[PDB]
Amino acid sequence: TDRVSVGNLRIARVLYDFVNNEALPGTDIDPDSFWAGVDKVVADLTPQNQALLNARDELQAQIDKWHRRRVIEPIDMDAYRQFLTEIGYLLPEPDDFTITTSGVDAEITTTAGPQLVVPVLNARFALNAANARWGSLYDALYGTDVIPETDGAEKGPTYNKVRGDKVIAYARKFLDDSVPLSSGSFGDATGFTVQDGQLVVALPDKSTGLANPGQFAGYTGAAESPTSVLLINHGLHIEILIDPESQVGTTDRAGVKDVILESAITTIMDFEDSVAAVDAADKVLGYRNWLGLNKGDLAAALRVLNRDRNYTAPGGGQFTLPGRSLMFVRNVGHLMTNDAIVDTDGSEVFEGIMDALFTGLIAIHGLKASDPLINSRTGSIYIVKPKMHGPAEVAFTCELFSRVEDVLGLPQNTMKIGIMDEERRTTVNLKACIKAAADRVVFINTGFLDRTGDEIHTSMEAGPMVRKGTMKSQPWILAYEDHNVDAGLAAGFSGRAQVGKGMWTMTELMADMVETKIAQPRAGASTAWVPSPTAATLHALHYHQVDVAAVQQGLAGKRRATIEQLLTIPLAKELAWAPDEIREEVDNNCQSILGYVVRWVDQGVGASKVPDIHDVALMEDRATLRISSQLLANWLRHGVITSADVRASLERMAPLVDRQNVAYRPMAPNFDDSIAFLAAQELILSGAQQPNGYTEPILHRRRREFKARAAE
Numbered sequence: 001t002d003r004v005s006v007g008n009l010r011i012a013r014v015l016y017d018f019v020n021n022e023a024l025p026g027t028d029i030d031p032d033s034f035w036a037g038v039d040k041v042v043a044d045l046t047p048q049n050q051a052l053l054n055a056r057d058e059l060q061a062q063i064d065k066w067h068r069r070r071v072i073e074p075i076d077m078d079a080y081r082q083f084l085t086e087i088g089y090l091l092p093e094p095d096d097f098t099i100t101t102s103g104v105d106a107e108i109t110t111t112a113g114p115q116l117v118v119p120v121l122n123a124r125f126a127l128n129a130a131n132a133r134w135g136s137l138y139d140a141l142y143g144t145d146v147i148p149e150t151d152g153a154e155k156g157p158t159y160n161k162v163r164g165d166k167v168i169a170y171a172r173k174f175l176d177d178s179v180p181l182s183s184g185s186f187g188d189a190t191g192f193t194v195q196d197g198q199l200v201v202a203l204p205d206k207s208t209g210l211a212n213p214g215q216f217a218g219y220t221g222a223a224e225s226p227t228s229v230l231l232i233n234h235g236l237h238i239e240i241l242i243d244p245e246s247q248v249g250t251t252d253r254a255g256v257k258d259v260i261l262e263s264a265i266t267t268i269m270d271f272e273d274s275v276a277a278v279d280a281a282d283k284v285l286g287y288r289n290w291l292g293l294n295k296g297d298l299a300a301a302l303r304v305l306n307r308d309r310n311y312t313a314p315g316g317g318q319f320t321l322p323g324r325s326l327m328f329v330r331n332v333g334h335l336m337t338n339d340a341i342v343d344t345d346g347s348e349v350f351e352g353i354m355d356a357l358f359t360g361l362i363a364i365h366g367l368k369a370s371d372p373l374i375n376s377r378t379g380s381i382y383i384v385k386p387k388m389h390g391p392a393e394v395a396f397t398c399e400l401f402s403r404v405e406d407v408l409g410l411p412q413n414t415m416k417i418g419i420m421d422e423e424r425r426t427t428v429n430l431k432a433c434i435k436a437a438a439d440r441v442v443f444i445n446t447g448f449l450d451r452t453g454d455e456i457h458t459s460m461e462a463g464p465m466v467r468k469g470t471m472k473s474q475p476w477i478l479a480y481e482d483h484n485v486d487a488g489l490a491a492g493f494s495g496r497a498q499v500g501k502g503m504w505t506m507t508e509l510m511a512d513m514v515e516t517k518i519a520q521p522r523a524g525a526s527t528a529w530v531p532s533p534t535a536a537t538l539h540a541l542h543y544h545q546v547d548v549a550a551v552q553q554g555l556a557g558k559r560r561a562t563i564e565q566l567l568t569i570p571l572a573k574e575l576a577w578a579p580d581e582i583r584e585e586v587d588n589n590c591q592s593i594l595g596y597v598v599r600w601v602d603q604g605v606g607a608s609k610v611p612d613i614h615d616v617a618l619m620e621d622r623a624t625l626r627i628s629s630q631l632l633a634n635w636l637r638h639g640v641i642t643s644a645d646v647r648a649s650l651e652r653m654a655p656l657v658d659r660q661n662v663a664y665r666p667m668a669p670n671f672d673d674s675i676a677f678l679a680a681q682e683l684i685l686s687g688a689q690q691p692n693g694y695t696e697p698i699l700h701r702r703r704r705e706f707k708a709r710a711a712e
């Protein structure tokens with residue numbers, strides 16, 4: 001066996017070597033002390049970790065039984081709520097309080113702006129995401145449907161000037177809206193100069209300054225002929241690039257070459273739902289990438305991390321702005337184990353415990369010079385903790401982090417928690433969950449996809465649920481979204497911690513994103529999730545339009561969701577659907593499941609663009625898979641569809657997925673010989689039996705089975 005013995009643990013050699021040779025050097029942590037710490041923390045905290053998981057199963061069995069023993073379809077909310085209280089699912093609300101988290105960076109306490117999530121196992125994507133702090137607005141507008149590809153404005157093989165002119169006009173209007181001139185429009189500017197520390201914009205018949213001269217932040221080049229002008233609005237930077245001899249600048253009335261937006265203020269380097277990592281080799285790939293990000297030397301072929309950006313202040317001094325997104329890391333949650341470490345009985349170790357130890361250790365490098373800059377200037381390590389159920393699971397995460405800090409010799413509370421509000425028992429106890437982490441929390445975020453999965457599984461026995469698309473507008477979810485903001489603001493998050501909302505998954509419908517996703521900062525969210533650097537630049541537009549700090553101030557003290565609203569189960573109404581609509585929903589979910597799972601199981605890819613039944617491209621990860629598999633399981637459970645409908649849909653959609661895919665193993669024609677097809681089937685047929693509907697147990701087993709079959 002290729003394992004290293006440390007106490008009761010048997011550590012995969014690839015992981016042991018990676019930690020000793022790559023992670024530990026430079027931290028001043030004694031290797032033997034670290035490994036003894038791993039063993040001690042795992043032994044001490046595994047029992048409570050297991051108890052928490054058993055409590056989930058006990059609560060869910062009681063809720064199942066509660067539904068089974070009643071008849072009346074209109075659920076009596078008074079009794080339901082008394083029941084949830086009796087069994088300890090719904091806990092007393094704590095007294096009001098203010099969070100005390102300290103040592104947090106400005107990107108989190110103060111700046112409102114986009115938050116990018118990226119799979120850590122893809123070093124190229126991760127580098128691009130870290131560099132997405134700054135992004136070209138011209139590129140985002142030209143390359144996406146935000147500028148419609150109408151007649152004459154189509155994207156071609158070469159530059160379309162009619163399209164570029166539309167891009168230019170769009171950005172001039174954004175400038176007018178965001179940094180207004182004293183008089184006139186940026187669209188009429190002929191030049192920019194800096195005079196007596198002020199920005200002067202030349203117009204045809206006159207010159208003008210900014211209506212708010214304080215929005216001038218700096219420039220580059222000579223004041224009388226700058227190469228760029230730097231502005232600020234709602235704490236976010238805008239940079240106008242001036243180059244009349246550039247391809248675009250030549251066509252521009254002021255020689256403007258591009259408008260650069262400060263875009264992804266923070267990035268979540270993801271070990272959880274957007275990656276597939278089922279053994280020590282997979283975990284080491286991700287840990288090594290996370291290490292290179294924190295040491296600053298990650299290079300994918302050479303694509304490297306950006307340096308900071310140098311500016312001249314309006315008066316004339318020199319200053320710098322960060323060139324990189326401030327990085328969080330998303331650890332896995334409390335459920336899964338991984339055989340990267342096993343004990344003497346051969347039992348796998350809890351993966352959340354391991355991630356805290358190893359991503360925590362690695363993150364120390366991001367607090368020190370990067371053989372120049374840091375991740376956190378204020379000395380914090382930022383860990384998103386997903387899939388927690390209630391305040392006791394938050395407290396466990398706090399204790400885990402406390403024990404890791406002791407092993408790493410870090411100050412207590414160095415390891416901060418971004419709390420995902422993406423499970424129903426956390427939603428209805430959210431205030432207590434924040435209080436459990438009052439000195440560590442740096443955000444709450446409505447992970448609405450996982451939250452929809454948990455909604456379905458929790459009430460699985462109540463009846464058939466509405467269609468998957470209907471879920472986004474159901475009463476429970478709108479109350480959940482408002483209740484999250486209310487709790488955060490009441491705990492003092494404004495100016496202290498992020499209030500975050502969920503991911504835009506329609507990666508090619510950028511005009512729709514720009515039109516619709518403005519709802520999130522309008523709701524007082526200081527950040528929200530985007531899937532790409534391009535989407536981060538476009539979503540930044542919303543934070544120039546919306547004054548999030550003012551919105552949050554106006555929401556102060558409001559209580560816009562009741563517990564009854566939060567508990568409103570999304571049961572479908574009598575005779576809700578025609579047979580053709582039931583068919584479409586089954587086909588849509590099966591296509592979503594199969595297109596995600598085949599690349600998960602065959603290629604270890606945890607996030608994939610999968611076209612839906614309407615050929616809209618959806619960026620899918622485990623949470624959307626949790627929704628689809630749970631919904632089909634719920635429809636099968638209640639007689640909406642038959643097992644033949646499921647099988648026929650899977651078999652119907654599989655050749656289309658095979659078509660859409662290319663080191664690729666086709667699933668058709670011999671479906672039951674395809675590990676990936678069988679995984680997709682098992683996720684549906686066993687969905688009702690998975691703990692809280694989680695997909696990892698089946699995905700992990702099937703991916704390991706595929707890896708094993710591939711090695712013979």
Ligand SMILES: O=C(O)/C(O)=C/C(=O)c1ccc2c(c1)OCCO2
Pocket residue numbers: 117118119270273274422446447448449450451502503505530531607619620621623
């Ligand atoms: O709603 C939640 O439960 C939640 O956690 C969502 C995600 O994890 C998510 C979704 C899509 C992605 C992604 C992450 O990362 C890469 C881009 O595509």
Ligand SMILES: [Mg+2]
Pocket residue numbers: 273386420422447449450623
């Ligand atoms: Mg989630």
